[PDB]
């Protein structure tokens, strides 16, 4: 019938429906808060030999105190992180306080919501989730769906096995498990490995700890963060 | 599909609309015929006036565009009196911006490639009018060229367009290859005796509009009932 | 038709625009009207339907002043054919404006003609769904009155009719003999003829709105005046 | 939409029905010779009404730098007429370089407004291009879609395959001197039907003195010892 | 048909007809306007535990005497909401005064469809020198003076329900225990004060939340 | 259509024994490109009937009628 | 001639087709079904039957066969089945 | 049936389908009816309402002093036409300090209306105006329907059920010039009750009127404004 | 009805139209890229070898579109033309703007960027051509980049592009050893990779076209190998061909 950005005979958005539906074709993203570090992993499971790791960017930097995962076509995500970028500076240009999560997920669900607008524009096929520490010390993490809308979440859990991943972190979202920094990550671990086999390196995790700048973590200490999980798993026969 | 309804390439390699717009000049009921002679150009087409409450001072298709070059229009009325005024603007622009007058030539050349820009695009349609237009040209001689729908631009000697031009054109060709050269008398009698045989009514001399352009003589004269009927007289005779 | 005849930019099979073709059929669709060339002048013609009557004394009517001395009579679809009068007037102005003096007909005619014709050339746009003739005097050119249909082109005409009855007016038209007649013969006699053409045999009352141009208004084309010319609707009547 | 469009799946039916329309029915021969290039057509006109010395198949867009072309002449006209502003303004821009063959590669690659943007109907015109500025001459092929192909000798009729045939076959070669233009003609003869003539075939002649349309007593002349 | 300007057959263009049966997605609100003030109540409808309640608002004030009930896309909702607030600050830019909640509804309504049509209906309600007043504006851009409206999925069972429990002389404290009563009945679970969201409108009041989860005084006599 | 008929003026003329009367109503509107020879040439001139056909034809009609 | 028509149930029609429905099963009318009539606005004669379908075999995957004095029963199935027929 | 589509294409048969369509817009709204006089014009507006406890919306619209309009369909491109109307009114105040004439104004719409009727991609304004004025030329009434042809009017009625009211109007017409102000207001009050069904009956909340006469400028009465009219109601339903 | 253009995702959610331009990349045309220290270098494949044409524009596939990287299309030619020209112009206008070569990765995201734009927004065709870079800067030395018409570019070590892409993908999988990897045995696993993925043995020098971008003193040599160095390569993999069969 139509699928174009008209509204169809029983209401919805079907174009903006599909592009929603888009972001399964991805990549799972988890993170959450704690009031001492935000923590997120994406897990990728597909580097072949001859390809350089380090321009994959499935996690990228805004404004040194927040950061956005991609979930969804990776151009359109790029593209929205360029212009998220630029008009975090430009408030940075402005309004001289640095930029504020909840404002630059505020823009980025305005641009999606601007492109689902009017039918020229296909409607940004991407669902992202942006974390990072408020200049008044609280940290926070904003999940926008692709068609305009945006969410404070306490997890994310967004793309393939979002629905499981996410009832993994309701299930027990323990503050007291949350409490420490370590305990953060190895919260986010073990509920990110959970997602596909996750066996050798395929989780790529994030931290940005209060005022430091981006942390990427390194391998090693990734497969020390697992070993440490495997030791909670086990005595617990 | 819309091959055939719009001014796009047919699958087979052919353009379709403007084979119909041609097919638009013969609609409408009327024929003309030009011959070029050794120092003249003359053009003649049939008046066909339903009722005489018409004003049979204003039903003419042929017109000055300039003050040496005369055209006759084929088809649709309307359109034929757009090219005539687009034709008009070119021969004063034309004026305005290179001092000389507008050789026929160029004329008829700009008149194509506005009809060959309507060809191209899809917003616009062509004209159903093929112009014929004469004019004297210094180290020339007469000239006498046709403007199609298409824009392609040619015509010489003897040309005629309009419902019944192939016969004209059959018996112009027998006459051309007869070699002999036309004088300003035998030009207009071959004229005449063509489209009456194409039309055969022996043309009392009311029913066609002839325009005459000399080398001695300049401009376009339209020529009189006086004098069409006098050129009628000398040839049955 | 059936595939070809959808928008104006599509030309037929054979060669037609069956967008203009179809917009002819509303003009033979809507009331008639009829205008004479006079001895000395011009004399317009044309029954309204008074289709209810709440309306007011005859309102929206089919004539119309594009110029001081220029008429206009149009038949079709009258909101169309008022934008097109709108057309008309504001051409006139301009041309007043730019090279003084009034605008001849023939060239008035010839502007609106190649402005109507620019509508029905493109596909966005539809062709104008109205024939009118243009009617106007002066000393020095005589009286003129061109005939515009809904996409063709403005032809001379001694005395022309358009609208649901063209051919019966026009066999009465050319019955009666124009050239040597004066105005006030004439706007009796397309009184005579509009009430010839059928008016209450399937529809309503009609009204007669006639209009003038020539030496006995020097120029100046205006609507008649109605309180006389009601006995040369009298007249009709017999 | 409003561009060179119509592209399915591994295809670009619009621009391939384009080529179907440039198969054409004038052969319009070219051939790069040692000395210089050689574009010969025929001029078929329908009767004797019509004239050839009123218009043209070759064009000299610049001092040397010739064109012929394919079917579709209204389009081949205003293709023409923006290939020549294209080389004037050029010439303009970078003043006095007498840019021909330096300019033919440089015009060929400015034929992207050529087809590149069609303007919602594509072109339907493939057209030979030839130059000899540079000391060497050129000869290039711009197709309704494609680009420059830098040919060494080729055709665009309605018999285009063996005319080509006929060219390979008849060893277009390396060594020929400017006088090819003998086997042009017979490559025409082949994609011709009828006794030939000064005006029924056009050819221009693009050497290192530069461009010029042969005049129908050249043709003759040519066309007489065949 | 299909076209967003055609009309219908019958009477009356359609797509307009589809965005209206927007709010049926949308999500249920209810306001009531008394002579006290205008209570607006609505549910978050919060979909897990991990979303922050705050974040789900569909209740925002446009402006000090005007607050806004959204029932529809909240994409659409935001910018309807931001111009609301833009030219409710034009107005009192200009005018050095409180714009009246009928004029900002006109305005919204002017802007509704001027771009696909948008699918949200709104509940204005704030004081002014005519009263407390309750304005229901629709994806079509056509805005009514209300008194007791309901808008949302359940729409025809809770204005229903709205038409017989509500009288003329009722106050603020009797308006907002119906209207959770109702939204109770209406909705699948229970009306949590993390999942029902309450506004008041008072005449000597700028309209803020409802007491934040010390709103439970007016859900335990529910 | 009436060209077709003309260009059928071979059908074995000679052979054939078949010619075509044009019955039209007006003599007006009738392609005059049809009436050179070669084509339907030949027209006889028939119009209301005078005063002598007239009583002609009424004593012929009231032939069968003996009152 | 005489073409006629309805299915354009009001809250009277409604109830009376709760009546002569609730007829039939283990029902009585002690149930405050004139509640759920109101819950439907025009919900024809064909989904009454349905909801009082509903009910029996609410009452059966219950398993009890009573349903003259289950009407709170009755109400809680009728009431989440119009929620389900609305929305499901 | 393809013709029908489009306000652009032409039918076959004669005048095209969506501008009749249109016309089915104002057809499909409440009822209102206009009547002129000797001095004052008239309008009664049945204020449809939604549900008892919303308001019973808003018709009978103010454009100036001496000019209301009654809008009978649309409602969203009808604030569109109040606005130009009054930006017009506007306009003649300001340049020659003049009330705008009606007749010139209604002309103004229709031509405004008259493009989206012609223009590609254009709905045509599908709202019934009863414009009720007094210029100089004493009271008058103007009907504009989508179509964009306008007419003038005694005693006209637009909306659901209005042939009732113009059969009525037509009856009574003959005695309206000699009519008191409250007569008249009661004659289109009977006019308007004989609309709708028996069962409803004339409210002081569910009608508007609109008066403006010589000295009476423009005025919206209703429920308190409209008991003084509403009394004498001679209620035959 | 008029005709719209199809920019629109699909009842599950693809973009196919996209996803049948990025494919029908792979029917037609071959390039491969091949990075190594000291020296990065591109393969190409001559589709058209007629013997009519007489190879003036001295390279068809590879392109040179700034002083530190070169390009290579495998797309239709109308529209790698005017991307390699819109690409020239935005690494010269980096140039211009910060008085510094312009970055690899810089230069392809923004190439990338304007080919999401032609997929994202208008009723305009997503350029069908998918091309490899290689280049060197500062930063991080010798990097090769491919980019599909998808407009998602990656940064590739080892890869190809043309029709028969996997094999030669494969091929390089199979042999390709990083770090011992050198410039002179690039080039004899290029060689290697083209003569398996184009079916007749002993390739000409003719079908074949590579371009290796060397680092000179503080300057990059982007030189394109011409037949007889090319044919020299050719028959060195040839001796170690009979060789390697000979010695079984």
């Given at each position: 019938?139509?699928?174009?950005?008209?509204?169809?005979?029983?209401?919805?958005?079907?174009?903006?429906?599909?592009?929603?539906?888009?972001?399964?074709?991805?990549?799972?993203?988890?993170?959450?808060?704690?009031?001492?570090?935000?923590?997120?992993?994406?897990?990728?499971?597909?580097?072949?030999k001859?390809?350089?790791?380090?321009?994959?960017?499935?996690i990228?930097?805004?404004?040194?105190?927040?950061?956005?995962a991609?979930?969804?076509?990776?151009?359109?995500?790029?593209?929205?992180?360029?212009?998220?970028?630029?008009?975090?500076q430009?408030?940075?240009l402005?309004?001289?306080?640095?930029?504020?999560?909840?404002?630059?997920?505020?823009?980025?669900?305005?641009?999606?919501?601007?492109?689902?607008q009017?039918?020229?524009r296909?409607?940004?096929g991407?669902?992202?989730?942006?974390?990072?520490?408020?200049?008044?010390?609280?940290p926070?993490?904003?999940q926008?769906?692709?068609?305009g809308?945006?969410?404070?979440?306490?997890?994310?859990?967004?793309?393939?096995?979002?629905?499981?991943?996410?009832?993994?972190?309701?299930?027990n979202?323990?503050?007291?498990?949350?409490?420490?920094?370590d305990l953060?990550?190895?919260?986010?671990?073990?509920?990110?490995?959970?997602?596909?086999?996750?066996?050798?390196?395929n989780?790529?995790?994030?931290?940005?700890?209060?005022?430091?700048?981006?942390?990427?973590?390194?391998?090693?200490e990734?497969?020390?963060?697992v070993?440490?999980?495997?030791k909670?798993?086990?005595?617990?026969? | 599909?819309?091959?055939?309804?719009?001014?796009?390439?047919?699958?087979?390699?052919?353009?379709?609309?403007?084979?119909?717009?041609?097919?638009?000049?013969?609609?409408?009921?009327?024929?003309?015929?030009a011959?070029?002679?050794?120092?003249?150009?003359v053009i003649?087409?049939q008046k066909?006036?339903?009722?005489?409450?018409?004003?049979?001072?204003?039903?003419?298709?042929?017109?000055?565009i300039?003050?040496?070059?005369?055209?006759?229009?084929?088809?649709?009325?309307?359109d034929?009196?757009?090219?005539?005024?687009?034709?008009?603007?070119?021969?004063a622009?034309?004026?305005?911006?290179?001092?000389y007058?507008i050789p026929?030539?160029?004329?008829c050349?700009?008149?194509?490639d506005?009809?060959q820009?309507?060809?191209?695009?899809?917003?616009?349609?062509?004209?159903?009018?093929c112009?014929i237009?004469i004019?004297?040209?210094?180290?020339?001689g007469p000239?006498?060229?046709?403007?199609?729908?298409?824009?392609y631009?040619?015509?010489?000697?003897?040309?005629?367009?309009?419902?019944?031009?192939?016969?004209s054109?059959?018996?112009?060709?027998?006459?051309?290859?007869?070699?002999?050269?036309?004088?300003?008398?035998?030009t207009?009698?071959?004229?005449?005796?063509?489209?009456?045989?194409?039309?055969?009514?022996?043309?009392?001399?009311?029913?066609?509009?002839?325009?005459?352009?000399?080398?001695?003589?300049?401009?376009?004269?339209?020529?009189?009932?006086?004098?069409?009927?006098?050129?009628?007289?000398?040839?049955?005779? | 038709?059936?595939?070809?005849?959808?928008?104006?930019?599509?030309?037929?099979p054979?060669?037609?625009?069956?967008?203009?073709?179809?917009?002819?059929?509303a003009?033979?669709?809507?009331?008639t009207?009829?205008?004479?060339?006079?001895?000395?002048?011009?004399?317009?013609?044309v029954?309204?339907?008074?289709?209810?009557?709440?309306?007011?004394?005859g309102?929206?009517?089919?004539?119309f002043?594009?110029?001081?001395?220029?008429?206009?009579?149009?038949?079709?679809?009258?909101?169309?054919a008022?934008?097109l009068?709108?057309?008309?007037?504001?051409?006139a102005?301009?041309?007043?404006?730019?090279?003084?003096?009034?605008?001849?007909?023939?060239?008035?005619?010839?502007?609106?003609?190649?402005?109507?014709?620019?509508?029905?050339?493109?596909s966005?746009?539809?062709?104008?769904?109205?024939?009118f003739?243009?009617?106007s005097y002066s000393?020095?050119?005589g009286?003129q009155?061109?005939?515009?249909?809904?996409?063709?082109?403005?032809?001379?005409?001694?005395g022309?009719?358009?609208?649901?009855?063209?051919?019966?007016?026009k066999?009465?038209?050319?019955?009666?003999?124009?050239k040597?007649?004066?105005?006030?013969?004439?706007?009796?006699?397309?009184?005579?003829?509009?009430?010839?053409?059928?008016?209450?045999?399937?529809?309503?009352?009609f009204?007669?709105?006639?209009?003038?141009?020539?030496?006995?208004?020097?120029?100046?084309?205006?609507?008649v005046?109605?309180?006389?010319?009601?006995?040369?609707?009298?007249?009709?009547?017999? | 939409?409003s561009?060179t469009?119509?592209?399915?799946?591994?295809?670009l039916?619009?621009?391939?029905?384009a080529?179907?329309?440039?198969?054409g029915?004038?052969?319009?021969?070219?051939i790069?010779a040692?000395?210089?290039?050689?574009?010969?057509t025929?001029?078929?006109?329908?009767?004797?009404?019509?004239?050839?010395?009123?218009?043209?198949?070759?064009?000299?867009?610049?001092?040397?730098?010739?064109?012929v072309?394919?079917?579709?002449?209204?389009?081949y006209?205003?293709?023409?007429?923006?290939?020549?502003?294209?080389?004037?303004?050029?010439?303009?821009?970078?003043?006095?370089?007498?840019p021909?063959?330096?300019?033919?590669?440089?015009?060929?690659?400015?034929?992207?407004?050529?087809?590149?943007?069609?303007?919602?109907?594509?072109?339907?015109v493939?057209?030979?291009?030839?130059?000899?500025?540079?000391?060497?001459?050129?000869?290039?092929?711009?197709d309704?879609?494609?680009?420059?192909?830098?040919?060494?000798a080729?055709?665009?009729?309605?018999?285009?395959?063996?005319?080509?045939?006929?060219?390979?076959?008849?060893?277009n070669?390396?060594?020929?001197?400017?006088?090819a233009?003998?086997?042009?003609?017979l490559?025409?003869?082949?994609?011709?039907?009828g006794?030939?003539?000064?005006?029924?075939?056009?050819?221009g002649?693009?050497?290192?003195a530069g461009?010029?349309?042969?005049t129908?007593?050249?043709?003759?002349?040519?066309?007489?010892?065949? | 048909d299909?076209?967003?300007?055609?009309?219908?057959?019958?009477?009356?263009?359609?797509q307009?007809?589809?965005?209206?049966?927007?709010?049926?997605?949308?999500?249920?609100?209810?306001?009531?306007?008394?002579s006290?003030?205008?209570?607006?109540?609505?549910?978050?409808?919060i979909?897990?535990?991990?979303?922050?309640?705050?974040?789900?608002?569909?209740?925002?004030?446009?402006?000090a005497?005007?607050?806004?009930?959204?029932?529809?896309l909240?994409?659409?909702?935001?910018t309807?909401?931001?111009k609301?607030?833009?030219?409710?600050?034009?107005?009192?830019?200009?005018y050095?005064?409180?714009?009246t909640?009928?004029?900002?509804?006109?305005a919204?309504?002017?802007?509704?469809?001027?771009?696909?049509?948008?699918?949200?209906?709104?509940?204005?309600?704030?004081?002014?020198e005519?009263?407390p007043?309750?304005?229901?504006?629709d994806?079509?851009?056509?805005?009514?003076?209300?008194?007791?409206?309901?808008?949302?999925?359940?729409?025809?069972?809770?204005?229903?329900?709205?038409?017989?429990?509500?009288?003329?002389?009722?106050?603020?404290?009797?308006?907002?225990?119906?209207?959770?009563?109702?939204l109770?009945?209406?909705?699948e679970?229970?009306?949590?004060?993390?999942?029902?969201?309450?506004?008041?409108?008072?005449?000597?009041?700028?309209?803020?939340?409802?007491?934040?989860?010390e709103?439970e005084?007016?859900?335990?006599?529910? | 259509?009436?060209?077709?008929?003309?260009?059928?003026?071979?059908?074995?003329?000679?052979?054939?024994?078949?010619?075509?009367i044009?019955?039209?109503?007006?003599?007006?509107?009738?392609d005059?490109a049809?009436?050179?020879?070669?084509?339907?040439?030949?027209?006889?001139?028939?119009?209301?009937?005078?005063?002598?056909?007239?009583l002609?034809?009424?004593?012929?009609?009231a032939?069968?009628?003996?009152? | 001639?005489?073409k006629?028509?309805?299915?354009?149930?009001?809250?009277?029609?409604?109830?009376?087709?709760?009546?002569?429905?609730?007829?039939?099963?283990?029902?009585?009318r002690?149930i405050?079904?004139?509640?759920?009539?109101?819950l439907?606005?025009?919900?024809?004669?064909?989904?009454?039957?349905?909801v009082?379908?509903?009910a029996?075999?609410?009452?059966?995957?219950?398993?009890?066969?009573?349903?003259?004095?289950?009407?709170?029963?009755?109400?809680?199935?009728?009431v989440?089945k119009?929620?389900?027929?609305?929305?499901? | 049936?393809?013709?029908?589509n489009?306000?652009?294409?032409w039918?076959?048969?004669?005048?095209?389908?969506?501008?009749?369509?249109?016309?089915?817009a104002?057809?499909?709204?409440?009822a209102?009816?206009?009547?002129?006089?000797?001095?004052?014009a008239?309008?009664?507006?049945?204020?449809?309402?939604?549900?008892?406890?919303?308001?019973?919306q808003?018709?009978?619209?103010?454009?100036?002093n001496?000019?209301?309009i009654?809008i009978?369909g649309l409602?969203?491109?009808?604030?569109?036409?109040?606005?130009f109307?009054?930006?017009?009114?506007l306009?003649?105040?300001?340049?020659?300090?003049?009330?705008?004439?009606?007749?010139?104004?209604v002309?103004?719409?229709?031509?405004?209306?008259?493009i989206?009727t012609?223009?590609?991609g254009?709905?045509?304004?599908?709202?019934?105006?009863?414009?009720?004025?007094?210029?100089?030329?004493?009271?008058?009434?103007?009907?504009?329907?989508?179509?964009?042809?306008?007419?003038?009017?005694?005693?006209?009625?637009?909306?659901?059920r209005?042939?009732?009211?113009?059969?009525?109007?037509?009856?009574?017409?003959?005695?309206?010039?000699?009519?008191?102000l409250?007569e008249?207001?009661?004659?289109?009050?009977?006019?308007?009750?004989?609309?709708?069904?028996a069962?409803?009956?004339?409210?002081?909340?569910?009608?508007?009127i609109?008066?403006?006469?010589?000295?009476?400028?423009?005025?919206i009465?209703?429920?308190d404004?409209?008991?003084?009219?509403?009394?004498?109601?001679?209620?035959?339903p | 009805?008029?005709?719209?253009?199809?920019?629109?995702?699909?009842?599950?959610?693809?973009?196919?139209?996209?996803?049948?331009?990025?494919?029908?990349?792979?029917?037609?045309?071959?390039?491969?890229?091949?990075?190594?220290?000291?020296?990065?270098?591109l393969?190409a494949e001559?589709?058209?070898?007629?013997?009519?044409?007489?190879?003036?524009?001295?390279?068809?596939?590879?392109?040179?579109?700034?002083?530190?990287?070169?390009?290579?299309?495998?797309?239709?030619?109308?529209?790698?033309?005017?991307?390699?020209?819109?690409?020239?112009?935005i690494?010269?206008?980096?140039?211009?703007?910060?008085?510094?070569?312009?970055?690899?990765?810089?230069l392809?995201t923004?190439?990338?960027?304007?080919?999401?734009?032609?997929?994202?927004?208008?009723?305009?065709?997503?350029?069908?051509?998918?091309?490899?870079?290689?280049?060197?800067?500062?930063?991080?030395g010798?990097?090769?980049?491919?980019?599909?018409?998808?407009?998602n570019?990656?940064?590739?070590?080892a890869?190809?592009?043309?029709?028969?892409?996997?094999?030669?993908?494969?091929?390089?999988?199979?042999?390709?050893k990083?770090?011992?990897?050198?410039?002179?045995?690039?080039?004899?696993?290029?060689?290697?990779?083209?003569?398996?993925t184009?079916?007749?043995?002993?390739?000409?020098?003719?079908?074949?076209?590579?371009?290796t971008?060397?680092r000179?003193?503080?300057?990059?040599?982007?030189?394109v190998?011409?037949?007889?160095?090319?044919?020299?390569?050719?028959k060195?993999?040839?001796?170690?061909?009979?060789?390697?069969?000979?010695?079984?």
């Amino acid at each position: 019938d139509r699928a174009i950005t008209v509204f169809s005979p029983d209401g919805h958005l079907f174009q903006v429906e599909y592009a929603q539906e888009a972001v399964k074709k991805g990549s799972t993203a988890v993170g959450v808060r704690g009031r001492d570090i935000v923590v997120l992993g994406v897990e990728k499971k597909s580097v072949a030999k001859l390809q350089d790791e380090r321009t994959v960017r499935k996690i990228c930097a805004l404004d040194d105190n927040v950061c956005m995962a991609f979930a969804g076509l990776t151009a359109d995500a790029r593209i929205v992180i360029n212009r998220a970028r630029v008009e975090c500076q430009s408030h940075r240009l402005t309004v001289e306080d640095p930029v504020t999560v909840e404002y630059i997920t505020r823009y980025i669900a305005s641009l999606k919501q601007r492109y689902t607008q009017s039918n020229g524009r296909r409607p940004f096929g991407i669902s992202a989730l942006i974390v990072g520490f408020d200049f008044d010390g609280t940290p926070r993490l904003y999940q926008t769906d692709p068609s305009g809308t945006y969410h404070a979440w306490k997890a994310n859990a967004i793309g393939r096995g979002a629905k499981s991943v996410r009832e993994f972190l309701e299930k027990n979202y323990t503050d007291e498990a949350i409490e420490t920094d370590d305990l953060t990550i190895k919260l986010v671990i073990k509920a990110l490995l959970e997602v596909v086999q996750s066996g050798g390196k395929n989780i790529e995790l994030a931290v940005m700890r209060r005022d430091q700048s981006l942390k990427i973590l390194n391998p090693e200490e990734i497969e020390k963060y697992v070993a440490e999980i495997e030791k909670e798993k086990e005595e617990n026969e | 599909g819309f091959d055939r309804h719009i001014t796009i390439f047919s699958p087979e390699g052919r353009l379709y609309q403007v084979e119909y717009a041609f097919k638009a000049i013969n609609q409408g009921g009327l024929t003309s015929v030009a011959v070029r002679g050794k120092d003249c150009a003359v053009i003649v087409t049939q008046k066909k006036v339903p009722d005489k409450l018409l004003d049979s001072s204003t039903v003419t298709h042929l017109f000055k565009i300039t003050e040496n070059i005369g055209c006759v229009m084929t088809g649709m009325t309307a359109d034929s009196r757009s090219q005539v005024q687009r034709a008009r603007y070119e021969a004063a622009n034309w004026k305005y911006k290179y001092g000389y007058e507008i050789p026929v030539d160029m004329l008829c050349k700009r008149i194509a490639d506005i009809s060959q820009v309507y060809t191209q695009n899809a917003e616009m349609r062509p004209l159903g009018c093929c112009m014929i237009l004469i004019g004297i040209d210094e180290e020339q001689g007469p000239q006498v060229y046709k403007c199609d729908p298409a824009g392609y631009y040619c015509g010489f000697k003897a040309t005629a367009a309009g419902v019944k031009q192939t016969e004209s054109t059959s018996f112009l060709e027998k006459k051309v290859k007869k070699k002999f050269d036309w004088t300003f008398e035998q030009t207009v009698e071959t004229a005449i005796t063509c489209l009456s045989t194409v039309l055969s009514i022996d043309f009392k001399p009311s029913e066609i509009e002839v325009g005459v352009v000399t080398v001695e003589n300049p401009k376009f004269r339209i020529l009189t009932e006086a004098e069409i009927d006098a050129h009628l007289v000398a040839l049955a005779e | 038709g059936t595939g070809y005849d959808l928008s104006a930019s599509t030309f037929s099979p054979d060669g037609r625009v069956f967008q203009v073709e179809y917009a002819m059929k509303a003009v033979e669709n809507s009331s008639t009207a009829i205008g004479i060339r006079c001895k000395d002048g011009v004399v317009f013609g044309v029954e309204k339907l008074v289709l209810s009557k709440l309306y007011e004394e005859g309102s929206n009517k089919r004539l119309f002043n594009v110029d001081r001395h220029v008429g206009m009579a149009v038949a079709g679809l009258l909101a169309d054919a008022r934008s097109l009068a709108d057309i008309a007037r504001e051409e006139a102005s301009n041309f007043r404006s730019n090279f003084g003096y009034n605008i001849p007909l023939k060239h008035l005619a010839d502007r609106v003609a190649m402005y109507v014709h620019a509508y029905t050339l493109y596909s966005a746009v539809r062709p104008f769904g109205c024939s009118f003739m243009l009617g106007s005097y002066s000393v020095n050119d005589g009286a003129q009155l061109y005939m515009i249909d809904p996409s063709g082109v403005s032809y001379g005409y001694w005395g022309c009719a358009i609208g649901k009855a063209r051919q019966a007016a026009k066999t009465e038209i050319e019955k009666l003999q124009m050239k040597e007649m004066t105005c006030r013969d004439i706007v009796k006699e397309v009184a005579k003829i509009i009430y010839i053409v059928h008016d209450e045999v399937k529809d309503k009352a009609f009204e007669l709105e006639l209009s003038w141009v020539g030496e006995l208004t020097n120029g100046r084309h205006e609507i008649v005046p109605k309180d006389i010319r009601e006995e040369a609707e009298k007249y009709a009547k017999e | 939409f409003s561009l060179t469009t119509f592209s399915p799946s591994g295809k670009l039916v619009q621009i391939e029905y384009a080529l179907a329309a440039v198969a054409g029915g004038a052969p319009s021969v070219g051939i790069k010779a040692a000395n210089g290039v050689v574009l010969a057509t025929e001029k078929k006109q329908k009767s004797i009404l019509y004239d050839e010395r009123s218009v043209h198949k070759v064009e000299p867009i610049t001092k040397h730098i010739g064109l012929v072309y394919s079917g579709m002449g209204p389009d081949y006209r205003v293709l023409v007429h923006r290939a020549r502003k294209l080389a004037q303004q050029y010439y303009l821009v970078y003043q006095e370089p007498i840019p021909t063959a330096q300019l033919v590669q440089r015009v060929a690659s400015v034929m992207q407004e050529y087809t590149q943007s069609g303007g919602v109907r594509p072109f339907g015109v493939s057209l030979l291009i030839c130059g000899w500025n540079e000391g060497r001459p050129y000869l290039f092929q711009s197709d309704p879609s494609g680009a420059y192909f830098a040919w060494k000798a080729t055709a665009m009729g309605k018999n285009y395959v063996n005319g080509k045939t006929f060219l390979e076959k008849r060893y277009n070669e390396d060594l020929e001197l400017e006088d090819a233009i003998h086997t042009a003609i017979l490559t025409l003869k082949e994609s011709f039907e009828g006794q030939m003539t000064e005006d029924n075939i056009e050819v221009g002649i693009c050497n290192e003195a530069g461009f010029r349309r042969l005049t129908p007593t050249e043709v003759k002349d040519y066309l007489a010892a065949i | 048909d299909r076209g967003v300007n055609t009309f219908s057959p019958e009477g009356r263009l359609f797509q307009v007809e589809y965005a209206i049966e927007a709010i049926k997605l949308g999500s249920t609100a209810i306001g009531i306007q008394t002579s006290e003030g205008v209570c607006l109540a609505v549910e978050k409808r919060i979909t897990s535990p991990l979303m922050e309640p705050s974040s789900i608002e569909k209740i925002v004030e446009i402006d000090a005497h005007i607050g806004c009930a959204m029932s529809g896309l909240i994409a659409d909702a935001k910018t309807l909401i931001d111009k609301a607030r833009v030219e409710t600050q034009n107005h009192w830019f200009t005018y050095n005064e409180t714009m009246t909640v009928e004029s900002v509804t006109q305005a919204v309504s002017n802007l509704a469809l001027q771009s696909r049509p948008f699918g949200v209906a709104l509940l204005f309600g704030g004081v002014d020198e005519k009263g407390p007043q309750l304005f229901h504006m629709d994806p079509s851009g056509t805005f009514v003076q209300c008194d007791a409206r309901a808008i949302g999925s359940a729409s025809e069972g809770a204005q229903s329900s709205l038409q017989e429990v509500y009288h003329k002389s009722m106050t603020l404290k009797e308006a907002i225990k119906s209207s959770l009563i109702i939204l109770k009945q209406v909705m699948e679970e229970k009306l949590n004060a993390t999942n029902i969201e309450l506004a008041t409108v008072q005449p000597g009041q700028n309209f803020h939340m409802f007491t934040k989860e010390e709103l439970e005084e007016v859900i335990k006599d529910i | 259509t009436l060209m077709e008929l003309l260009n059928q003026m071979d059908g074995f003329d000679t052979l054939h024994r078949v010619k075509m009367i044009m019955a039209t109503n007006r003599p007006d509107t009738l392609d005059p490109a049809l009436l050179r020879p070669g084509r339907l040439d030949r027209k006889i001139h028939i119009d209301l009937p005078n005063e002598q056909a007239r009583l002609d034809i009424l004593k012929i009609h009231a032939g069968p009628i003996t009152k | 001639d005489r073409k006629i028509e309805f299915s354009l149930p009001d809250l009277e029609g409604r109830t009376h087709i709760f009546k002569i429905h609730a007829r039939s099963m283990s029902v009585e009318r002690d149930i405050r079904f004139e509640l759920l009539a109101r819950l439907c606005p025009n919900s024809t004669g064909a989904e009454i039957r349905s909801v009082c379908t509903e009910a029996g075999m609410f009452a059966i995957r219950a398993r009890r066969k009573i349903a003259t004095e289950k009407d709170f029963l009755e109400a809680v199935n009728k009431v989440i089945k119009s929620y389900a027929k609305f929305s499901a | 049936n393809q013709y029908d589509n489009d306000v652009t294409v032409w039918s076959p048969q004669g005048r095209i389908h969506q501008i009749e369509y249109a016309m089915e817009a104002v057809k499909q709204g409440s009822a209102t009816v206009g009547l002129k006089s000797k001095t004052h014009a008239v309008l009664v507006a049945l204020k449809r309402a939604q549900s008892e406890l919303a308001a019973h919306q808003k018709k009978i619209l103010h454009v100036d002093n001496h000019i209301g309009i009654s809008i009978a369909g649309l409602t969203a491109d009808a604030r569109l036409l109040c606005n130009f109307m009054r930006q017009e009114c506007l306009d003649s105040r300001f340049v020659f300090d003049r009330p705008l004439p009606v007749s010139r104004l209604v002309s103004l719409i229709g031509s405004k209306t008259q493009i989206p009727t012609q223009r590609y991609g254009r709905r045509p304004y599908g709202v019934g105006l009863l414009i009720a004025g007094y210029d100089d030329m004493g009271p008058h009434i103007f009907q504009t329907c989508p179509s964009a042809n306008y007419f003038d009017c005694r005693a006209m009625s637009i909306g659901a059920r209005s042939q009732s009211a113009r059969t009525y109007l037509e009856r009574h017409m003959s005695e309206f010039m000699e009519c008191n102000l409250n007569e008249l207001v009661k004659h289109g009050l009977r006019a308007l009750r004989e609309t709708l069904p028996a069962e409803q009956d004339l409210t002081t909340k569910n009608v508007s009127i609109g008066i403006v006469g010589k000295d009476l400028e423009f005025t919206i009465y209703d429920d308190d404004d409209v008991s003084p009219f509403l009394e004498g109601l001679e209620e035959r339903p | 009805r008029y005709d719209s253009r199809t920019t629109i995702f699909s009842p599950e959610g693809r973009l196919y139209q996209v996803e049948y331009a990025m494919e029908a990349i792979g029917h037609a045309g071959t390039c491969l890229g091949i990075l190594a220290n000291d020296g990065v270098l591109l393969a190409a494949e001559r589709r058209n070898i007629h013997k009519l044409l007489d190879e003036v524009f001295f390279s068809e596939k590879i392109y040179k579109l700034n002083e530190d990287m070169a390009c290579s299309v495998a797309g239709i030619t109308s529209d790698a033309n005017v991307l390699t020209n819109e690409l020239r112009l935005i690494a010269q206008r980096y140039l211009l703007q910060y008085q510094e070569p312009i970055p690899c990765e810089q230069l392809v995201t923004a190439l990338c960027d304007i080919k999401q734009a032609y997929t994202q927004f208008g009723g305009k065709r997503p350029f069908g051509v998918s091309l490899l870079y290689i280049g060197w800067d500062k930063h991080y030395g010798f990097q090769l980049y491919q980019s599909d018409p998808s407009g998602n570019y990656g940064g590739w070590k080892a890869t190809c592009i043309g029709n028969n892409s996997a094999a030669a993908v494969s091929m390089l999988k199979q042999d390709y050893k990083e770090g011992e990897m050198t410039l002179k045995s690039a080039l004899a696993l290029a060689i290697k990779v083209l003569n398996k993925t184009m079916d007749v043995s002993k390739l000409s020098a003719e079908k074949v076209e590579i371009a290796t971008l060397t680092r000179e003193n503080g300057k990059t040599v982007i030189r394109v190998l011409k037949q007889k160095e090319v044919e020299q390569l050719i028959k060195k993999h040839e001796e170690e061909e009979a060789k390697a069969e000979r010695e079984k």
